[PDB]
Design goal:
The chain is built from 8 helices and 18 strands. The chain has helices at about 35-40, 55-60, 150-170, 185-195, 205-210, 240-250, 300-310, 320-340; strands at about 5-10, 15, 30, 50, 70-75, 80, 85-90, 100-105, 110-115, 135-140, 175-180, 200, 220, 230-235, 255-265, 280, 285-290, 310-315. About 25% of the residues lie in helices and about 20% in strands. It has 2 domains: about 1-145 and about 295-340, 4-Layer Sandwich (Metallo-beta-lactamase, Chain A); about 150-295, Rossmann fold, CATH 3.40.50. The chain is α/β, with parallel strands linked by helices and about 350 residues long. The two termini are about 35 Å apart. The protein has a 7-stranded mixed beta sheet, sandwiched between helices. The protein has a 6-stranded mixed beta sheet with strand order 6-7-8-9-10-18. α3 (about 150-170) packs parallel to α4 (about 185-195). It binds nickel (II) ion (NI). Binds constitutively to TP53BP1. Binds CDC27, which is itself a component of the anaphase promoting complex (APC). Binds PIAS1. It comes from Homo sapiens. This is DNA cross-link repair 1A protein.
Length: about 350
Amino acid sequence: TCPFYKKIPGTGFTVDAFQYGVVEGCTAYFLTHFHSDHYAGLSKHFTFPVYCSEITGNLLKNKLHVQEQYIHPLPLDTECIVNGVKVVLLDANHCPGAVMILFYLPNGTVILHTGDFRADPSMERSLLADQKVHMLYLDTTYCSPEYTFPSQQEVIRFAINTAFEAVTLNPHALVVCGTYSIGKEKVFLAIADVLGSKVGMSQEKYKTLQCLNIPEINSLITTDMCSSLVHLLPMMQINFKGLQSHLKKCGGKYNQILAFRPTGWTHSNKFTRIADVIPQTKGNISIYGIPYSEHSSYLEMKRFVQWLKPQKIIPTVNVGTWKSRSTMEKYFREWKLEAGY
Ligand code: NI
């Protein structure tokens, strides 16, 4: 049974609600982004209307085989009528194709559902500027002040400089980047660009990247591993055993691996600056954990909410424990008293 925080009151609509069977009264199912916890349940046998971005719709059709007749892509930044209700899709600054959804309810209430997002000041100049929001359904993944991490630009600067130094000292080093979902593509694209290489990967991952409308993608990626000195591997293989095994396969072309594991936040964020990050090393193999986040930091979240001034907040992440829920409610009240709404 579908939980309350996935239902949109006064509509036939649900958000990210595909794992509950046929939801009573749902005439349109929205999907914010193509991450498995959110699409859980969709397949080629789904026969209800799915509303989403163009990119998410390319992934539903090619990767999950959802039939074309049930896929309803909407442009961003554009007022659309769905089943008699005005909606807008906004870029979520999460992974490719990810959106927030603005719903203008027939009774005059305005609801924002962030999906998963990384709040940014540029959102203060979208179509959100123009009007009031009564209810905010909020991605609270890192809603606690201990969650700090650098900008995505600083993280990429660190990875480019690290890779370029290593391969210039040793032209026979291979760079490897972990992946387990869409998102974080700038990590491996930026490194391959500085090295003058395409990125090599499996046919399955190439297929997924080909759905993402990335400009000039055919110039950037390949399935021919042997021609490439940046390889993508599943995240589970990013360990000394998996990498040893991979280096064997390359036919004595390389004699060193430098590997990157983009994580979310880790507690080594609480002590170390990005600049000071060091790898784990075993022999000719080195592994860097880099804190590339596609979710809001605590400070980015608080800035966004204090700007929007919603009348009510409904968290969508960390809702399963009483202690989590109580912690989040405390911060929402601090933010409201500090800013005066
Ligand atoms: Ni996500």
